[PDB]
Amino acid sequence: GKGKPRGLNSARKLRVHRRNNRWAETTYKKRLLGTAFKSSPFGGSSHAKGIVLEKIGIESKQPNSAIRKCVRVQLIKNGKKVTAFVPNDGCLNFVDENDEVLLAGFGRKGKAKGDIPGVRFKVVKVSGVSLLALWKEKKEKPRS
């Protein structure tokens, strides 16, 4: 009989029911338990800034198997470490390690992208330049 009560003095039980069952759809859980600010070192940060440590390359997953051009960064605003990427074939050596870098996220919401294991971030700004420039040779990289 539609085991949700319907009698014309319901309002209270309706509210408590719906607001003890919001806790399924995660998006609500992340917003209100808020750990999207506590952990997830990019504190709701549509970007961040950090510095490079030393370039590494990790094996990829199933059938698509190759070296996938990986980077190791430590942020500055909190002091936390992640692993990022370089698109646009070359320009993996625009690194010049100990140069800073401006990171941004993928699109799969911290869940991994494509084939890569344990990586979350592109790079669109770095050391005052945007990779779209040099890889199309619009600007020219100043050195640090």
Partner 1 sequence: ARAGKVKSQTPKVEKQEKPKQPKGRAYKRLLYTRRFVNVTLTNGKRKMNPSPS
Partner RNA sequence: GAUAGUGGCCUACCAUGGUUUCAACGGGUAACGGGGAAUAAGGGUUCGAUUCCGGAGAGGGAGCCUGAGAAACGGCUACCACAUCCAAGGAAGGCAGCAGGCGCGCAAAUUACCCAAUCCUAAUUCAGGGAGGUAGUGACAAUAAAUAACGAUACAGGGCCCAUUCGGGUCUUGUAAUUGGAAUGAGUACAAUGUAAAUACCUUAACGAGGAACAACUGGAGGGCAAGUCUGGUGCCAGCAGCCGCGGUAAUUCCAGCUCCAGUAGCGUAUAUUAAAGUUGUUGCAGUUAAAAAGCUCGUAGUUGAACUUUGGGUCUGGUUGUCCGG
State how far the alpha carbon of 138 is from the alpha carbons of 94, 125, 126, 143, in Å: 14, 14, 15, 16
Out of RNA, partner 1, none, which partner does residue 4 contact, by CB within 5 to 8 A per kind? RNA
CA distance 25 to 144: 46
The least distance separating RNA from the CB of residue 60, rounded to whole angstroms, comes to 7
| DSSP-assigned letter for residue 59 | B
The stretches of 4-138 forming alpha helices (DSSP H) are 11-18, 26-33, 35-38, 131-134
What would the x/- binding string for RNA be over residues 39 to 58, using CB under 7 A?
Answer: ---xxxxxxxx---------
For partner 1, which is the closer residue by CB, 29 or 69? Answer: 69
Type of residue numbered 37 = F
Out of RNA, partner 1, none, which partner does residue 14 contact, by CB within 5 to 8 A per kind? RNA
70-129 residues in contact with RNA (CB under 7 A) are: 76-77, 87-90, 92, 102, 104-110, 113-116, 122, 124
The angle at the Cα of 29, spanning 77 to 84, to the nearest 5 degrees, equals: 35
Contacts with partner 1 by CB under 8 A lie at 57, 67, 69, 89-90, 92-93
Q: Do residues 70 and 85 make contact, with C-beta atoms less than 8 angstroms apart?
A: yes
Binding footprint of RNA on the chain (CB under 7 A): 2-10, 12-14, 18, 21-22, 24-25, 27-28, 30-31, 34, 36-38, 42-49, 63-69, 76-77, 87-90, 92, 102, 104-110, 113-116, 122, 124, 132
